[PDB]
Structure formats: structure tokens, C-alpha cells
Design an enzyme around this catalytic site. Sequence first.
Site, PDB file in Angstrom:
ATOM      1  N   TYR A 171       0.825  -1.204   0.000  1.00 56.83           N
ATOM      2  CA  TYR A 171       0.000   0.000   0.000  1.00 56.83           C
ATOM      3  C   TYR A 171       0.866   1.264   0.000  1.00 56.83           C
ATOM      4  CZ  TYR A 171      -3.949  -3.074   0.938  1.00 56.83           C
ATOM      5  OH  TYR A 171      -4.894  -4.075   0.807  1.00 56.83           O
ATOM      6  N   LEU A 215     -18.391   2.252  -5.378  1.00 60.41           N
ATOM      7  CA  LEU A 215     -19.578   2.129  -6.221  1.00 60.41           C
ATOM      8  C   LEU A 215     -20.868   2.182  -5.411  1.00 60.41           C
ATOM      9  CD1 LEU A 215     -20.526   1.629  -9.163  1.00 60.41           C
ATOM     10  CD2 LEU A 215     -20.683  -0.806  -8.514  1.00 60.41           C
ATOM     11  N   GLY A 267     -22.823   5.968  -3.211  1.00 59.56           N
ATOM     12  CA  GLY A 267     -23.559   7.052  -3.837  1.00 59.56           C
ATOM     13  C   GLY A 267     -22.875   7.527  -5.100  1.00 59.56           C
TER      14      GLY A 267
END
Lengths: 330, 331, 331, 330
Positions: B53, B221, B224
Amino acid sequence: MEYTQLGRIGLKVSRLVLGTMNFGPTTDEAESHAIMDAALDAGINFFDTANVYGWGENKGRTEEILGSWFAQGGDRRDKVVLATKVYGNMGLGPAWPNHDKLSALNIRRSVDASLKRLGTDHIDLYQFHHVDRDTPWDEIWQAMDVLVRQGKILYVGSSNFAGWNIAQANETAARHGRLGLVSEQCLYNLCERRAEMEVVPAAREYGLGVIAWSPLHGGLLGGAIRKEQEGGNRRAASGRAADALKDPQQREQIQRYEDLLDKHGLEPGEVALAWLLTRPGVTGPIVGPRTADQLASAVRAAELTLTDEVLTALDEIFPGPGPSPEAFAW
Amino acid sequence: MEYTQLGRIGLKVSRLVLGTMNFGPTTDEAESHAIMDAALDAGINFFDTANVYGWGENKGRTEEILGSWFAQGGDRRDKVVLATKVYGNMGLDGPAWPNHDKLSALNIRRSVDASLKRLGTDHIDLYQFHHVDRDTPWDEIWQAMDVLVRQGKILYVGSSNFAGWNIAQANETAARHGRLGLVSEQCLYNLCERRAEMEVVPAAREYGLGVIAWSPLHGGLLGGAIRKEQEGGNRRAASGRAADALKDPQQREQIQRYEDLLDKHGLEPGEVALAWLLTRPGVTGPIVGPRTADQLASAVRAAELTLTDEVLTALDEIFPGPGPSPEAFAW
Amino acid sequence: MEYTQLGRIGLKVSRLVLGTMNFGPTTDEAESHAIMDAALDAGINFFDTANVYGWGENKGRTEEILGSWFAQGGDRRDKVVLATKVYGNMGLDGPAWPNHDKLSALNIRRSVDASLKRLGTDHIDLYQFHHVDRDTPWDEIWQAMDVLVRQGKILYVGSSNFAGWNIAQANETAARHGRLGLVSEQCLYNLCERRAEMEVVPAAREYGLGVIAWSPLHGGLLGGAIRKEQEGGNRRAASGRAADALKDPQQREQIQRYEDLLDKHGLEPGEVALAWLLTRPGVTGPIVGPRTADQLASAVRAAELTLTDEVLTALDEIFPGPGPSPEAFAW
Amino acid sequence: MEYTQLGRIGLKVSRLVLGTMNFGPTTDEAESHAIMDAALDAGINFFDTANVYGWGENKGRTEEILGSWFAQGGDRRDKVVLATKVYGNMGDGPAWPNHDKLSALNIRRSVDASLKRLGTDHIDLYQFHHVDRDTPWDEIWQAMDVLVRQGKILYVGSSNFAGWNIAQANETAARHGRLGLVSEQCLYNLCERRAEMEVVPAAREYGLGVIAWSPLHGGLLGGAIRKEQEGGNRRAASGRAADALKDPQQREQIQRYEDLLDKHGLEPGEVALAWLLTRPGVTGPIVGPRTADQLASAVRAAELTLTDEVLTALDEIFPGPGPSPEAFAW
Ligand SMILES: NC(=O)C1=CN([C@@H]2O[C@H](COP(=O)(O)OP(=O)(O)OC[C@H]3O[C@@H](n4cnc5c(N)ncnc54)[C@H](OP(=O)(O)O)[C@@H]3O)[C@@H](O)[C@H]2O)C=CC1
Ligand SMILES: NC(=O)C1=CN([C@@H]2O[C@H](COP(=O)(O)OP(=O)(O)OC[C@H]3O[C@@H](n4cnc5c(N)ncnc54)[C@H](OP(=O)(O)O)[C@@H]3O)[C@@H](O)[C@H]2O)C=CC1
Ligand SMILES: NC(=O)C1=CN([C@@H]2O[C@H](COP(=O)(O)OP(=O)(O)OC[C@H]3O[C@@H](n4cnc5c(N)ncnc54)[C@H](OP(=O)(O)O)[C@@H]3O)[C@@H](O)[C@H]2O)C=CC1
Ligand SMILES: NC(=O)C1=CN([C@@H]2O[C@H](COP(=O)(O)OP(=O)(O)OC[C@H]3O[C@@H](n4cnc5c(N)ncnc54)[C@H](OP(=O)(O)O)[C@@H]3O)[C@@H](O)[C@H]2O)C=CC1
Ligand SMILES: NC(=O)C1=CN([C@@H]2O[C@H](COP(=O)(O)OP(=O)(O)OC[C@H]3O[C@@H](n4cnc5c(N)ncnc54)[C@H](OP(=O)(O)O)[C@@H]3O)[C@@H](O)[C@H]2O)C=CC1
Ligand SMILES: NC(=O)C1=CN([C@@H]2O[C@H](COP(=O)(O)OP(=O)(O)OC[C@H]3O[C@@H](n4cnc5c(N)ncnc54)[C@H](OP(=O)(O)O)[C@@H]3O)[C@@H](O)[C@H]2O)C=CC1
Ligand SMILES: NC(=O)C1=CN([C@@H]2O[C@H](COP(=O)(O)OP(=O)(O)OC[C@H]3O[C@@H](n4cnc5c(N)ncnc54)[C@H](OP(=O)(O)O)[C@@H]3O)[C@@H](O)[C@H]2O)C=CC1
Ligand SMILES: NC(=O)C1=CN([C@@H]2O[C@H](COP(=O)(O)OP(=O)(O)OC[C@H]3O[C@@H](n4cnc5c(N)ncnc54)[C@H](OP(=O)(O)O)[C@@H]3O)[C@@H](O)[C@H]2O)C=CC1
């Protein structure tokens, strides 16, 4: 006829397995006997049946029809790897407690009934018809080990397991020296490929044979649209096949299939069988002939060679998910 | 905050897991640190990160942001169940030098040392396989993990992106020799992607693993994304899985039906998606992926939400799931 | 008669093992019975046979000849350690029907019942794999053997024509679950063929197996076959191993020097070959292959012979062995 | 460069293994360093050495040469799978008791001396140089497990074992959770194929890598006749290559080999390396370059594709025995 080891074990089997579910309901006793003789002559040494086969009030008649075929002699029993099943209910809705599923109690009574109907003192491959989530593996393997050590069964197989049921079963067997599942009998064909996600990968990891039941999806894949106009559909007129043909998307899938094979001059039932024989890890399809001519059609399919062009076209009509986790994650 | 046992083991975790993947490429160090502080004050004690990450030339940056957070003191390290991962390539993005990715005992050794240094801690609580490695056998993996356990460098082992049958094989192999097996599986599971229901989650429940769901909003997704489509900024929903999904009309139709359904009921979409996972049998909790402090506070609200029978069945109608195998494809 | 333990187990066998392969095709039933009477009279208590012996359409005849011998009463069955074999195809010619040869549990089940019936006995003392079957795994094999052990149909399991690593894998597999493993290996070993010393006999010694040498005269080659080529008298030595060996000029010269060497020492060539095997470390004894009563009497004299260090050294010069691996090909 | 799994384990290795035995007594330190640089540039990530390499008074020099190569930074230690050996006497002649062989006592002292010369805290593949019939496997695995748990080694491998030693070693390790041998290093090449009887089949059964040492039989297969008259520091002028050339039957074999390759326009060193790469079970050869160009030659060999005509011709000159028991019985 092509042969192969059943997964990791020393048993050698034809790549066509003779399914017997039609013997009784759809094919009468004399024609069933004739199909079996023809399967032997073609070199098929591996027969699949179940205690429930026969339907309705006649559950078990399929085993009796094999019983009477063996009883003719001619080395039929000695030449055949005989497989049958425990789990299903032998009565007509809800079963009496422990008269279905995989408790050691139901295993004891079901093997004896199957052995009586088959007229043999042993079953070669005794299969769980379905996973039973309520029976632990130390109970199951106690039950099968009693039968192994008495000589009533040789090998144990699964059917309609999840991949992790195969792993759990065979690790539990290995802990105490027991031979685990030797094969998984799963639904796998052009229309239904989700066994690719985990069942087949797990079977391959643990060295089980993979034998595909309803390899034509209940007759759907054997030219069932073409035959609708001429009324040649029998098994293809009920069950999976009829339900699929009623659905517009699935029906058009079959239509493109029969059309593509018309263009290539190939028989649709034979392509479906031959397609399974190319799948990594598949021992072979369990063919479901209703007539001797359908068996001979299957025999020819075992010799078909599909071209890379047809294989990629079939992939385009009937895509598969491939293995988990890649099938839904990355 | 609601707490639960991580599957069968003695570890107690918040039902929200703080994901940290945004911390670096999407959220800067200062907002990342305040999210974690707010997460702790909310009672979240379970942090998920990975060595990779940070993305691109900055792989490792996320672990370092957690490290400088811990170095502030204040009982942060002692209070957090810290989870990171091994498997990913840590070099130039592109094909990896052999044994610098995957799950060989060689790569496990070098990866855990580099994670410990960047995290600035002497142990990882939950060291996770980022993905199944079909080429490393379980007696090699468990040798490598057990060396770390006996040295005190890790406590627990977990899986991510496994097949159900890999879970069974891993924990049966561990149990034959008295080792604690996998304690949790980190799998993609949300309203749009339910196929973990076929075999991953059933296997995890049978073996008593926790189930922690990554990308529980499908990468934005379900947050909203339609209503906010013509908005801008560094929104995770404006690219990746969420964007690609909105360009397929069938998937887009599902989200439209979903946002419309939640207008009718006065419910936020991001919050419903988190609450929905919290109802799923066997799910420990979602790994929430806040970009902002206010998205974290919203996640905390979602854990207090109680979806009605009516909304659940409507959610099913939009996003049907397959059920378990073999029933999902056979009978 | 000299007696010894069969490897590590409690069974005591004469160091001459009576082979029966000639009984049927080469020796008629009457002479086969006389040979067996005389072997028992000389104290031989250990008989080797196989289901396939008899040849062609008469596979099974050798076992039937032993059966009719045992049927003459007189303590015969009780006094003899009876060994037979499974793996061979019992049909006449060509490839076997699937699972009517090799070592699947299926063929094991049918082969032992047919053997028990032909032998007219309720148990075999030493049930032997005729050959390694690379396609059957050891948990399948030991399952089928353990079924027979617990039913009292066999006592002991042995191997024949295995590689050393098959021996190790078999007995390690059996030992993990408290099964008695292989108790003996029946391998080809004689002056002419010594490569069993590379790895088969070492593994057998490590695991405490008896070693019983089949074709100890290399199919008659070492019993004076060259002399009998002009006097007449070769039968078994006219075909197979021995005929091939004499078709090779280098092997024929070995045999010539062998017969020359023993003419000068006043020794019988078949007797020297048997006695040489009795000196080899790890070797329980040769499986003698008499065709006639007088060939059995010859074998018994060979078990009383003492070969001088001079002869042993001469034989080693003619018939060099490889010794153990890896030293045999590496260092 | 082609990579493969080292047998069944998760470690990935170049199919060319860099052997270092020349480094010290045959190749000087500068060119040794140069060969290692070239090997790493070509993607070779697997080096083999031994504590005894250096020979005589200079046993340990090879490990020292690798030690100073790692000390020139460059991500070198991180990039190389580092393999050395224990068994040989590090003091020449009769060894002090427990200063050779595989006692837990000699294992402890040998690995520390190796780690110091190599200047590294861990050995990736620590290999027994030879079977030791006098040390039992519970003692060996105890010693090796102490090293694994201290992180001083990752993997254990064997060298110059019989196949049955492999089976016994790995069965003993598996009984108690330990990862067994991961590779066997055996003499295997066109001239010496008896590893095919049992060593290699046992390695394949237990999922061991197979890396062949002296893959040119000590230079015998590298053009030794074409080069027999030329001087220099050639391995082929000494040792087993020179002994074989003094035997008429083995010289004729090499003559036919060199002639056959003259007709096909092939290099003998590369053909022998490429040949080992076709053999089933074989991870790769352990190349023994004396120069940087002999390394480049080995790199080309890994890209060569031998034709069936050449393979058949090689089999005609250099017949192998096949597996036991068939190689001597039936
Ligand atoms: N383990 C389990 O749960 C299950 C096990 N099985 C086993 O697998 C066997 C096969 O199952 P089944 O559904 O019958 O197999 P199929 O999918 O192949 O369907 C059988 C029907 O397909 C048609 N057909 C059969 N052969 C051909 C052929 N060459 N060419 C064209 N059409 C052909 C016939 O249809 P039509 O009658 O219309 O002429 C036949 O009745 C079964 O006998 C059974 O042993 C099957 C069901 C479940
Ligand atoms: N009680 C019994 O023994 C049987 C019951 N059935 C009933 O038929 C329904 C679906 O099968 P059908 O319409 O005839 O033809 P389908 O085309 O749908 O299925 C073909 C085969 O799949 C298997 N199967 C499918 N569903 C079930 C189910 N609940 N339970 C057990 N086996 C199933 C059966 O084979 P297989 O027998 O190998 O399992 C069946 O012959 C089911 O609802 C079931 O109640 C069907 C077959 C046996
Ligand atoms: N094991 C594996 O392979 C993987 C692990 N993970 C782990 O799981 C964590 C979550 O993954 P991720 O994709 O980020 O999860 P999500 O899909 O939930 O989050 C991505 C985006 O969702 C939106 N969002 C987040 N929280 C809310 C909220 N209350 N309300 C409304 N919208 C919200 C934001 O989108 P926006 O910016 O558009 O506003 C956020 O940037 C990760 O941090 C990581 O630790 C993730 C991927 C793979
Ligand atoms: N141009 C770009 O792609 C940029 C991406 N990022 C960051 O990358 C994340 C989104 O990733 P992205 O791929 O673009 O969109 P995706 O929605 O396709 O990926 C979402 C996550 O799923 C996991 N994943 C998906 N596919 C793979 C795959 N082949 N291999 C390994 N892991 C995979 C990764 O999580 P995991 O690592 O846990 O496996 C990934 O972050 C975000 O966190 C973003 O901030 C930042 C700057 C630029
Ligand atoms: N496990 C396996 O694969 C094998 C098992 N066996 C077993 O080993 C037994 C021995 O095998 P076999 O090949 O017969 O052994 P031999 O090598 O001893 O060959 C026997 C023949 O040698 C001659 N001969 C026998 N005894 C003497 C003697 N004192 N002096 C001089 N010549 C003699 C006779 O030759 P002639 O006929 O010319 O007179 C006899 O027919 C066999 O019966 C069988 O039990 C044998 C083959 C394979
Ligand atoms: N049992 C037999 O003799 C069989 C022979 N053959 C073929 O005949 C050739 C050898 O015949 P033969 O002259 O009697 O051998 P030899 O005279 O050279 O060797 C004598 C004994 O070795 C054993 N044996 C040798 N080869 C085989 C083999 N493929 N399969 C099984 N056992 C073998 C047999 O004993 P034992 O039976 O104890 O193994 C035979 O009695 C072989 O090349 C083979 O192609 C094929 C199948 C069976
Ligand atoms: N485990 C054990 O017991 C053993 C381990 N080993 C290990 O295996 C490695 C290889 O052993 P080694 O004997 O050196 O291998 P080789 O037999 O291949 O090499 C010896 C000589 O081959 C010639 N040669 C090398 N490469 C080429 C090439 N491309 N083209 C043409 N000729 C070439 C050179 O001979 P020339 O000088 O004449 O030009 C070289 O000095 C060793 O470094 C060691 O790591 C080796 C021996 C024992
Ligand atoms: N004897 C000499 O004249 C000189 C030799 N050398 C070096 O020694 C090698 C020449 O090989 P050499 O030993 O003379 O004969 P060989 O060529 O037959 O041996 C080649 C390799 O096989 C291995 N080996 C072979 N036999 C034995 C054995 N009893 N014990 C232990 N290992 C053995 C050794 O490798 P391994 O150690 O891996 O087992 C040896 O390096 C060359 O590498 C050379 O550089 C250097 C100066 C003088």
C-alpha cells in the site's frame, strides 16, 4: 477405447463411464442389458448407478436391472467397476429420520439393500450422493471403514461436494491412514461450468478422479432444439433441458451451438462429450444413453478430435469462470 | 462500538476494521493520522494494511504512515490489533525478481523484516497472505510462519483471496502438528459481488476463521457513486472498479435501482452497504476504507443502523447471491 | 539345514527357499511332488510360488500342484511357510483387462481369492507384490493388505522387483499407522547380475527386510550351461536370461572362465553360485529353482559348502559388483 | 532465462545453476567475481558452493570469494539463492572425529564457519555433501531444525544420496511437521546416467529438485578431444576427463559425440547442458564455467533446442539404464 487412472489411485477406468439412470424409467430391462453388453464390447469397464434410480415406487429397479445383468455370468461382474450411491430417500416426500443422508445408521442399511438388489457381495466404488452437512467426517469414515474391512466396499467417492468438503474429507481420512475419496462426481458440461471454481481444483489437488454427471445437461446439448420439431426428445423434454429451453437467453445459446455444429458437420451430443474429455482433471463424462445408438454415438465421441477453432467458438458461446479466487476477485 | 471474536480464536475485534489502503496515494499523512485517532476514539481496535500500500514508486508508504502514528505514543500500538500482508511485489511495478514476490519461505523472511522496520514495531498481530500461492506447499509456509511465531515477530496468521479449499488444506495441515491455523480470511464480499458465498465463507465458517470483507463498498460504487458522478476530486469512485462498473449498463442499472431505493427510505448508500455486510452469517465485519474523517464517522453510524426486513429483501432483489455450493449450481 | 530369521521379523526360514516356477511347464506334477517331499525332508520350510506360474493357458497350475501336495495331509501345510504373488495377468496373452493385473485394491481382492482356492488353503503366509506398481499409492495398497491381515487370510506382506526407494516408501507408510511393513524383498541377484547391490539390498537391510534372491543361477546360466551345450541337458538354460547371456560374447566368456575356474577347483557350478549368494551380506538365501530331485539334492549340498577366500576372490574378478550408490557411480 | 520451481517448493530458480568449484583453484578471484556478475546479469539467481571448495590448504577460499562478492553491495545477497554444503573435512587426509560427516556436532561448527566466510547471516539452501550412513535422520533433522528456527538456514537439500536415502529422509521429516529435502544434487550427464535407476525417480516421487553436478563430466563433454593438445589450466586435462580419455571405449564415445556435433554445427559444451535440460525431473545443470565466455556459452545452451534426430543420436552413443527394477530385472 481410452483408459486412465482414476485420479491418484491404482484403479484403471475407461474415459467413458456408463451412467444407468435411464435403465428402468426410460429404457426397459432388455434394452438396458443390451446397452451394458455393448458398453463392455466397446471396452467400458466403469458403471455408475444409485440406490434411488428407478423412480417413484420403483426406486432400486436400476440396481436390480444390473443385478440381473450380472446374474447372466460371462464374467460381467468381474470385468466391471461397479459404482453406486447412498444418501437419497428410497421412499416416495419427507423421509423417515435416518432413512436418508449420511449418518452411520443410514449407511449400514443402504449398503445392505444395494448389495441385495445388485446380487453381488461387494461394491467397488461407494459414493455419497450429496454432501451432508450434518454428519461429521469421523462418523462417516467409521461407517465406510467398517464396510472396507468387511470386504463389502473397496473405494469411497463423493458426489455433489464443495471443494472444501473434498479437502476436509481427505485430510480427515489421511490422519488415520484411511484411503480418502478417490473421485468426485460433479455436474459439469458446456452449460454449467462453475465446478471449475473450486470443486475441480480441489479434486485435482487431492488427486480425485472427476467424473461428470449429466454431461449433456440432461439432453439439452444433444440436439434438443433440432429434435423438438421431430419429437425425438424424451429426457431432453423434462428437467434441466426443458427449463433451459424455456429461458430465452439459454435457448439462444443452444441455438448458436446447434448452428455452429451444423456448419462444421459435427453431432451435438458427441461434441459435448468430447469437450469434457479435453478439460484438465476430468476423468471423463458419465454418458447417459437411452438407446444402444446413443451409446455408439458416445463411443464415437471418445474418438472425436475437436479443432482449436471449435474449442474457442464453444468457449465464446459457453464461457466458464475458471478458478477461485481469480474468478470473482483478482 | 460492537465487538466480536475473530472466528474461533481468543482475539476480540471491533466489527469495523480500519482499512488503510487510501493512506498515502489518496489521503495524506496528516488526514490519515486523524482518521486513525478518530477510529481509536470510536473503539475500532483492528487495523488492516499491506506492505504494497502506497502504490507505484511509494509501495511501503502506508506502513510508514502507521509507523509514525505509533511513534506518537499514547498507547496506540498496545491498543491496536495490527495486520499487514505478504505476497505482493515490493520493487518496480512490473515482473518481479524471482522470490521477491509470492509465498516462498525466502520471501516471507525478507518481507516481514521490511514491514516491521517500516511499521516501526517489533511484532505484527495478524500477518496475512495477500493471495493464495499455488506453488508453495503448506509445510513450507507453516515452517516460515512458525519460525516467526516462535521468535515473537507475529502472533496470528490469516489468509486473503483464498479459495475455500485452500482454507481447509491450510488449517488441516496446521492442525496435524499442533499449530494454530489461519484465523481469518480477507475476501472480496459486498452487495455487488456475492460469490464468496459459494465456498470461501462456508469453508471459513467450518474452520472457525473470521471473515473480513475488503472493498465493502466495491471501491466507492455503493457509496452514492451515481449521485456523485459528475463531482470531482481524488474520489476512489471516479476510477478503478467503480468507474469500470458504471460503464456497463447492467451494473449501472443495479446501482441506480439501489440509490433510488435508498432515497425512498432516507438511508445513505455507503452506510447501507456496510450495515448489510454486518448482517451476513459468518462475517466478522467490513474493512472500511474511509478517505476522510467524515467517511469514518459515517462508517461508525452504519454499524449502529438496523436494516428492516423490507429493505433486506429489496436489496436481495437487486443483488441476488448464489448461496453455497453445490446447491448453487447443482442441487 | 541352516536357518535364519527373515530380516527383522519373528519368522524363521531355511536359507534355501524352494522355488516352484518349474512345477508345471518344465517339471510334471509327480516329479514336482517328489521335489517338495524331498525339500521338506531336507528341512526346507519356505516355498515360493506365484499365481501366474504354469505359463500361458496353464497359469495357476503351479499353485494347483502345491494345492494337491498340501491335500496329501501329513502336516505339510502346517510345516511350510507358503509364499505366493499378486500383480501378474492371469489371462493368456496380450494386455490385461483393466484391473485384472497390477496392484489396485480391486485386483488384490480377486487375486488372493483365486490363489487361496487353487492352493486349497485358508491363508497365505507371505503374500508378495510380484513387481512395483508405480500407479497404485501405498495407502490404497496397505488398505487392501490390512483387510486380508485382519481377516486372517494373510500373515505377512513382501515385495519383489522393487527399487530401494519403493521399499523405503512402503515401510515408512506402513509404520506411520502401526502396520507391519514389507518383511522381505525378492530380487534378482546372482554372480551375473549384481546391480541389486546398488540400492535394493541396502534399502532392504536398512528397513530390516529379508532378501531372497530369485533366479540364483541366472536362469540356469551358472549351473554348467556351456558344458551341457555339447553333452546335452539344457532345458531352462536354453531359453530366456541364460540364452541371451550366451548370445553376448563378453557374457559368454565370463561363463567360460567361471566353468574353467571350477573345473580346476573340483567344484560344481550350480552349487558354487548358490553358496556365493549365501555369503552376501543381507541375503537371507537363494530361491533355488530345481527341475529335478537331483538338482534339489545338489542345492542342499551347496548349503553345506564353504568357499575359500581364494575362490571368492576369483569369482569377484570374473563377476565384479557395483557396490552401493552413490559410490557406485559418483564417489 | 528460463525459471522453474525447485521441485515441489515455492522457491523459483533459474534453470542454470552457477557452480563455483572452479573459483579459487582454477579461476582467479577477479574473473570469479566477473563470472558472478555476468551470471546475475543473465538472470541466474541460484549459486552452488561448498565449505571445502578452494581445495587443500585453501579449503574455504571459494566461500570467501563469494563473501567478498556479496560485500560489493548491489542487492547481491538479496538477489541470489545461496547454496553451500556440509560433510567434508575442513582441516587433508584422516579427519579429526566429528570434523567431517553429518553429526549434529559437525553440522553446528560447519555452518558457523560457512556463514562467516560468506559474510551473511543465512544460507538459503544448506546441503548435505554426501550421504552419511552413520548418522540417523532424527539426529540430522534435529540439527537442521535448530538452524531453521534460529533463521540461519531456510531449506535443506541433499547431494550424493541414494534414492532410498531421499525417501527415508523426507518420510522422517514429514512425520513431525518438518519440511524435508527440497533438492538433490547428483552426478548426471551424457557419460554418467545411472542416477536414472533410482536417485532421480525417488527425487521426483518426493518432489525434490534435481540439479546435476559436473554436467559436462568435468570438461570431457566440452570439446576435450578437439582441445586435447592445447595447454593451459584446463579442467579437461585432469581429473575424471583425463582418465576417461585414456580408456579406449570412452574416448571413442567422445569422438563420435564431437564428430556428430561437427556435422550438425553445434558446440559440445552447450549440447550437453541443453541435453540435461530435456531430462524429466531435472531442475537444471550446475554449470562449471572456468571463464566468463564459458558462462555466456552456458547461457546460449539454455536457449538451444535439440532436435529428435540429435536426441536419438545422443541416446545411441550414450545409452542410459532407465529406472530400477527394469534396468536390471524386468
Ligand atoms: N451424481 C448425481 O447427482 C447425478 C448422477 N447422474 C449419473 O450420470 C448419468 C448421465 O446423466 P444424464 O442426465 O442421463 O446424462 P445427459 O446429460 O447426457 O442426458 C441423457 C439424455 O441425453 C440424450 N443423449 C444421451 N446420449 C446422447 C448422445 N450421443 N447423443 C445425443 N443425445 C444423447 C438422451 O436424451 P433423450 O432421452 O431425450 O433421448 C439421454 O436420455 C446418469 O445415468 C447418472 O449415472 C446423473 C444425474 C445426477
Ligand atoms: N427422491 C429422489 O430420489 C429423487 C427426487 N427428485 C426430484 O426431482 C426434482 C428435480 O429433478 P427432475 O425434475 O426430475 O430432473 P432434473 O433435470 O432437474 O435433474 C436431473 C437429476 O438431478 C438430480 N437432482 C436434481 N434435483 C434434485 C433434488 N432436490 N434432489 C435430489 N436429486 C436432484 C437428480 O438426479 P439424482 O437422482 O442423481 O440426484 C435428477 O435425476 C427435484 O425437486 C426432486 O424432488 C429427482 C431425482 C431423485
Ligand atoms: N485483501 C485484498 O486483496 C484487498 C484489501 N483491501 C483492504 O480493505 C480496505 C477497503 O478497501 P476499499 O476499496 O478502500 O473499500 P471501499 O470500497 O469501501 O472504499 C473506497 C471508497 O468508498 C467510499 N466510502 C468509504 N467510506 C464511505 C462511507 N461511510 N460512506 C460513503 N462512502 C464511503 C470512498 O469513496 P470516494 O473516494 O469516491 O468518496 C472510499 O475512498 C482497504 O483499505 C484495504 O485495507 C482493499 C482491496 C484489496
Ligand atoms: N493509475 C492507478 O492505477 C493508480 C492507483 N492508485 C491506488 O490504487 C488503488 C486502486 O487500485 P486499481 O488497480 O487502480 O483499481 P481496482 O478497483 O481495479 O483495484 C482495487 C484493489 O483490488 C486489488 N487488486 C485488483 N486487481 C489486482 C491485481 N492484478 N493484482 C493485485 N491486486 C489487485 C488491489 O488491492 P490490493 O493492493 O490490496 O491487492 C486494488 O487496489 C487505489 O488505492 C489507488 O489509490 C494510486 C495512484 C494511481
Ligand atoms: N519374483 C520374480 O520376478 C521371479 C521369481 N522367481 C522364483 O525364484 C525360483 C528360482 O528361479 P529360477 O530361474 O528357476 O532359478 P535358477 O536361476 O536356479 O534356474 C533354474 C534352472 O537352473 C538349473 N539348475 C537348477 N538347480 C541346479 C543345480 N544344483 N545345479 C545345476 N543346475 C541347476 C536348472 O536348469 P535346466 O532346466 O537347464 O536343467 C533349472 O531349471 C523360481 O522358481 C521362482 O520361485 C524366478 C524368476 C522371476
Ligand atoms: N511371466 C512371463 O514370463 C512373461 C513374459 N513376457 C514377455 O517374455 C519376455 C521374457 O519371457 P521369458 O523368456 O520367460 O523371460 P526370462 O527367461 O528372460 O526370465 C525368466 C523369468 O523372468 C520373469 N520375467 C521376465 N520378463 C518378464 C516380463 N515382461 N513380465 C513378467 N515377468 C517377466 C519371469 O518370471 P516371473 O513370472 O516370476 O516374473 C520369467 O519366468 C519378456 O521380454 C516379455 O515380453 C510378457 C508377460 C509375462
Ligand atoms: N555435489 C558434488 O559432489 C559435486 C558438486 N559440484 C558442483 O557442480 C559445479 C559444476 O561442476 P564441474 O565439474 O565444474 O562441471 P563441468 O563438468 O561442466 O565443468 C568443468 C569444465 O567444463 C568445461 N566447460 C565448462 N563450461 C563450458 C562451456 N559452456 N562450454 C564448453 N566447455 C565448458 C570447462 O572445462 P575446461 O577447463 O577444460 O575448459 C570446465 O572447467 C561445480 O562448480 C560444483 O558447484 C561439482 C563436482 C562434485
Ligand atoms: N588432485 C589435484 O591434482 C588437484 C585438484 N584441484 C581441484 O580438484 C578438482 C579435480 O578433481 P579431483 O578430485 O582431482 O578428481 P575428479 O575429477 O574425479 O573429481 C571431480 C570432483 O568430484 C568430486 N569428488 C570426486 N571424487 C571425490 C572423492 N573421494 N571424495 C570427495 N569428493 C570427490 C569432487 O567434487 P566435490 O568436492 O564437490 O566432492 C571433485 O572436485 C578440481 O576442482 C581442481 O580445481 C586443485 C589443485 C590440484
